[PDB]
Every structure is written in structure tokens, then in C-alpha cells.
């Protein structure tokens, strides 16, 4: 992928430049403030990825993460993980860590971790400067509609100065008067500094005037010296707005390039819709698989290489190809294929006892954990082994190939085959327990199924695309009714072998089944597996 972000030294502008391409602006700053830009960074093309402690980070945010932390890592720069405080938002600690966790899950160490609140002093300082330099007045109206006219424009300077000084000292009533700019762009709705009266996370108490995303996340690009600043694609009729605060205070600028809002189908990610689904009961937690939250796909298996490789395939532009799980579940099929070894396991546990086979208990035998040259792990063989009844019908249709009377079937990774003998039914008419002697098919005879012997575990959880079709919204009325085929469900029977392991985010192939990953409910005794991808089907 960094073959494709290095090719943006084959498209963009190197350390410095800045004046070359974008919405370039020339003041008594361009050649003498950019001189200081390179006199602090050294070039070092700095970017940033700035979410919120409210944030939930869904797969589409990986196009954001791969971009910033990537271009830095590609073209030898750094990148700020910058938590967007602005308006104080309580606490929510689970996502405060979810972000830091997920950032590293993909493999990037953020150069620095900063909060927006870190710079409330110089944001205020430059706010004081903005009222004096003009283009900043104290108005009201709102909430008399932020959209109705445009009053108090060219008001007296000092009046808006002492009022802004009053605004923070507590001489106001949480609503009266804001601090706007003489803004145009759009529909000229300016709000630089509002007034709250609410505690903060980082700088609690002390403060009761707090800026806004527009004002905050323009200057901080400057402040921390950024030479790219990659915005998503809600920020189109806002290109004017970003280049407006810089130069109006004269600063080393970003350039702000935009990428395409790449969502995904079959998906819902908003916490007001999810923490709903948590409480309805369709899903477990916010990290429940089939949710498409980044912290969920981790649970589901899905190697962080597989998520990044997907991005190098369909991204790095301004086109927002909101695509499908099929072409993404086909990208993780690429990785679990040879990042995770073979193992095989049974579900419809059917007691099969082998009469005539050599020696006593166990007998090791080694399994090709990988159909390569790397090496073999071992699982106990005969007697009393386990196949699933889905590989045995009493009366077979010609399409059968597994176990039938007189139709012996091979045992995976074994020089042996069982011929089928007498079968037991027990109480009613259930195929209870069958038996057979093995002919050690060195004598050449195809059906070659899987098996376990001296088995083990407990739980295997199977998951489908939660909605039977696409992003529940496009006028079906409404969103809480695509939760069809249960999806779900679990099997706490499940007999697996000694290939595992017993640790809890490892991945496997269960031979002739699916690719399976371990889940954070596992111990070393009562272990539990998610079924990640479907084994190459469709």
C-alpha cells in the first residue's frame, strides 16, 4: 500500500512547497512563514488523524487511518493522533481506549497523542487577535435560526472585545451572545466561540467558553505544523472556510486534501442505532461480529493485514466506492489462507469406534498444518474417533461421497480408510453409534473426510450477514426489520482436537469447514471460536 502513497511524491508536494498547488495564497508570510515551517519540522511531511472520544471507528475510518498514518509512514513523515475535544462530552471511557487500541491493531504508532483542549490558550489568544484584526464580532440571533439574517456585522471592535472577555469570565447566561466571524463562503453561518458552562475532560472547570469544529480543527492543523491534513468528503463546501482562518492570522498553513466518504453496504455503525441493537438483543456488544465496527471485526477474526490490503485495492482517491462485504470477505480469504494453519474439527459428533487397528491408546500421527513444507503438528488417532453425521447417511443419494455401506471414505491425513460395518440405533430411530474396521487404504480407493480423536473444546459461534439485504434506510420503513435469519447461532457441543493451542485471538482453518478465530471469552479450558470467513465459497 505504501507503494501507492509513495506515488504521491509522484503527485503531491514535498516537505514545504505548500504554495505550489492548492488554494494557494500569497501574503507577507508565504516565503517567510514557510521558512519557519521548515525551520521547525525540517520538512518531515506531518499529517494527522483526529477523531473524538465519542468516536466508534467503523471500517470506513480505516480508509482514513491508512491514509494519514500511511502517507507519513510512506514518505518518511509523522502523524498526530489528535483527539477532538472541542465541546465537552462527558467521558465514555470504552471508546477512549477503543481508538488507541484500534490504531495499534492496524500497526501504526502515532508520533504523538494530543487532545484539542491542549491548545485552548492559544486558540483563545488568537481569538482575541481575531476580534481586534476585524472579521470577528459578537452577535446573537441564534437560536433565532442560525440560517435568518445577518445582524451586528461591522459593530464597534472594543465592544466585541470586552464582551468576549465578559463571555468567559462568567458575565453571561450560557446562551446570550456568541462570537462569530465576518463569514461569507455556503450560507455565511459563522460560529467561532460559543458559551457552555460545562466541565471538561482534560481541562475541567476553569473554562466556560468553548470553540467549534470549524474554528478548532482549522488552526490546530497550523499549530502542530501540518503539511497535508486529509479531510473526508463532508468537507467540500468548506474549503474556503479552512483557508480563511489561516492567513487572517498569518500562519504556516496546511493544504487540506479531501478523500471519498467510503462507507460499506449491509452495515449500520452509529451508536444511537447500535446501542439500540445492543439492548434489543439482535447483537451481543458493540464488538459483536457482522457489525462492521473495527473493534468488532477484530472479534470476528479478520486479520489487520487483510483490512489494510483491502484499502490498497479500492481506495487512495476521491471516489467514495461504498462497497460490499463480499469483496472484503474475499480479501480476508486471501490472508487467513496462509496466515492461519489447518486443524479440522467436528460438529455433529457421531461416535465412531474402530475395531482392528495397531497398538494401544493414542498413536500420534502428524498433520500438515500447512499444505507447504512448514511443520507438522500431532493429534491422537484410533480407536474411538469422531466424524459428523452430516458425513453419514444410511441411504445415500448417488451424489453421496462420504460414508455409505460398502462405500468407505478416507480419513484426512492418514494412510487409513474405514469400510463401514454394523450400526447401532439405540432407543428410537436415531443413528446412535456406528462401528467399523479400517483397511489402511494403501490399496487405492477414493471416497477423504476430517475427524478428531481424544477431542476437547466447547463453543463455536456462527455468523451471517445480519441484514438479508442493503443498509436498512433506503425507504423500506425502517431500519429495525432486516434482522432476519436469526444470525446467530452457536454450538456448545463441538469436538476439536489437540492442534489448539490454547491461546485468544489466534486464527485457524478448520479443514473442510471454515476459517475460525479465537474469541475473548476463551480461557485455556473453556475455549470459544468465531467463524470468520466462509471457506472460499461463492
Amino acid at each position: 500500500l505504501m507503494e501507492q502513497l509513495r506515488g504521491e511524491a509522484l503527485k503531491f508536494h514535498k516537505p514545504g512547497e505548500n504554495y505550489k498547488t492548492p488554494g494557494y495564497v500569497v501574503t507577507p508570510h508565504t516565503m517567510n512563514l514557510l521558512k519557519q515551517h521548515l525551520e521547525i519540522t525540517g520538512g518531515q511531511v506531518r499529517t494527522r488523524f483526529p477523531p473524538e472520544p465519542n468516536g466508534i471507528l467503523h471500517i470506513g475510518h480505516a480508509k482514513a487511518i491508512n491514509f494519514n498514518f500511511g502517507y507519513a509512514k510512506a514518505n518518511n513523515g509523522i502523524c498526530f493522533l489528535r483527539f477532538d475535544d472541542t465541546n465537552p462530552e462527558k467521558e465514555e471511557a470504552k471508546f477512549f481506549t477503543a481508538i488507541c487500541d484500534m490504531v495499534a491493531w492496524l500497526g501504526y504508532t502515532p508520533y504523538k497523542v494530543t487532545y484539542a483542549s491542549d491548545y485552548f490558550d492559544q486558540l483563545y489568544a488568537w481569538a482575541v487577535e481575531l476580534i481586534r484584526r476585524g472579521l470577528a464580532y459578537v452577535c446573537h440571533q441564534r437560536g433565532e435560526e442560525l440560517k435568518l439574517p445577518s445582524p451586528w456585522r461591522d459593530r464597534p471592535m472594543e465592544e466585541s472585545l470586552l464582551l468576549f472577555e465578559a463571555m468567559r469570565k462568567g458575565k453571561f447566561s450560557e446562551g446570550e451572545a456568541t462570537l462569530r466571524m465576518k463569514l461569507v463562503m455556503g450560507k455565511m453561518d459563522p460560529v467561532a466561540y460559543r458559551v457552555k458552562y460545562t466541565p471538561h475532560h482534560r481541562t475541567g472547570d476553569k473554562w466556560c467558553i468553548y470553540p467549534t469544529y470549524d474554528y478548532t480543527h482549522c488552526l490546530c492543523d497550523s499549530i502542530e505544523h501540518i503539511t497535508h491534513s486529509l479531510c473526508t468528503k463532508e468537507f467540500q463546501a468548506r474549503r474556503s472556510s479552512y483557508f480563511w482562518l489561516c492567513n487572517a492570522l498569518d500562519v504556516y498553513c496546511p493544504v487540506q486534501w479531501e478523500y471519498g466518504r467510503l462507507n460499506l453496504h449491509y452495515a449500520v455503525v452509529s451508536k444511537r442505532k447500535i446501542l439500540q441493537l445492543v439492548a434489543t438483543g439482535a447483537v451481543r456488544d458493540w464488538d459483536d461480529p457482522r457489525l462492521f465496527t473495527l473493534t468488532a471485526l477484530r472479534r470476528r477474526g479478520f486479520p489487520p493485514e487483510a483490512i489494510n490490503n483491502f484499502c490498497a485495492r479500492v481506495g487512495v482517491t476521491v471516489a467514495q466506492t461504498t462497497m460490499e462485504p463480499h469483496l472484503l470477505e474475499a480479501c480476508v480469504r486471501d490472508v487467513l489462507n496462509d496466515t492461519a494453519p489447518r486443524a479440522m474439527a467436528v460438529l455433529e459428533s457421531l461416535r465412531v469406534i474402530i475395531t482392528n487397528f495397531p497398538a494401544a491408546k493414542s498413536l500420534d500421527i502428524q498433520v500438515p498444518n500447512f499444505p507447504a513444507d512448514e511443520g507438522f503438528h500431532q493429534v491422537p488417532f484410533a480407536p474411538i474417533v469422531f466424524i459428523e453425521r452430516t458425513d453419514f447417511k444410511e441411504e445415500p443419494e448417488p451424489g453421496f461421497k462420504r460414508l455409505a455401506w460398502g462405500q468407505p471414505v478416507g480419513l484426512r491425513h492418514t494412510g487409513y480408510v474405514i469400510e463401514l460395518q454394523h450400526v447401532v440405533k439405540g432407543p428410537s430411530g436415531c443413528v446412535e453409534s456406528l462401528e467399523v474396521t479400517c483397511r489402511r487404504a494403501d490399496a487405492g480407493e477414493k471416497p477423504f473426510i476430517h475427524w478428531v480423536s481424544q477431542p476437547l473444546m466447547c463453543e463455536v459461534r456462527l455468523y451471517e450477514r445480519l441484514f438479508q439485504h442493503e443498509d436498512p434506510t433506503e425507504v423500506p420503513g425502517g431500519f429495525l426489520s432486516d434482522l432476519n435469519l436469526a444470525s446467530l447461532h452457536v454450538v456448545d457441543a463441538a469436538l476439536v482436537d489437540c492442534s489448539v493451542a490454547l491461546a485468544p485471538f489466534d486464527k485457524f482453518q478448520f479443514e473442510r469447514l471454515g476459517y475460525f478465530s479465537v474469541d475473548p471469552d476463551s480461557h485455556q479450558g473453556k475455549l470459544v471460536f468465531n467463524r470468520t470467513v466462509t471457506l472460499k465459497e461463492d
Binding site: 470586552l162 464582551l163 458575565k171
Partner: protein, 76 residues
């Protein structure tokens, strides 16, 4: 044999007296939590207003002390 349907019309008339007497429990325990949590919500009205009282007295204690060396403006 002829005492099952006599005991049944005793234990089905039980559901009768159960779910009536239950609906007087289930609606007296509503007045309890309502009578209480209401007269506390108008007792927040005695704090929140007494707060603005000892708030407005204090903004005019500052503004008499921030004119002591500072500037004051109107009205507003």
C-alpha cells in the same frame, strides 16, 4: 374425578382475585413514587431559583469590583 373442575374454578378464580389485587398494588406503588419524586422536582425549583438569587447578587459584586479598576458597558 368430580373434584378437579371444582378445584379448578377455585384456582382460576384465584387468578381473578390475584390480578385485581395485583393491579391495586401495581397502581398504589405508582402514586408512592409519583407523590415523592414530584415534590422533589419542585424542590429543585427552590434550589435552582435560590441559586440564581445568590448568582445575581454575585455578578453585581464582581461588576462593582471590576469597575473598581476596569470598564463597564451597557445594558444589556
Amino acid at each position: 374425578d368430580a373434584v378437579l373442575k371444582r378445584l379448578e374454578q377455585k384456582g382460576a378464580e384465584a387468578d381473578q382475585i390475584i390480578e385485581y389485587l395485583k393491579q391495586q398494588v401495581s397502581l398504589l406503588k405508582e402514586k408512592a413514587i409519583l407523590q415523592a419524586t414530584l415534590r422533589e422536582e419542585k424542590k429543585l425549583r427552590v434550589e435552582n431559583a435560590k441559586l440564581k438569587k445568590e448568582i445575581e447578587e454575585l455578578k453585581q459584586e464582581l461588576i462593582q469590583a471590576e469597575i473598581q479598576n476596569g470598564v463597564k458597558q451597557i445594558p444589556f
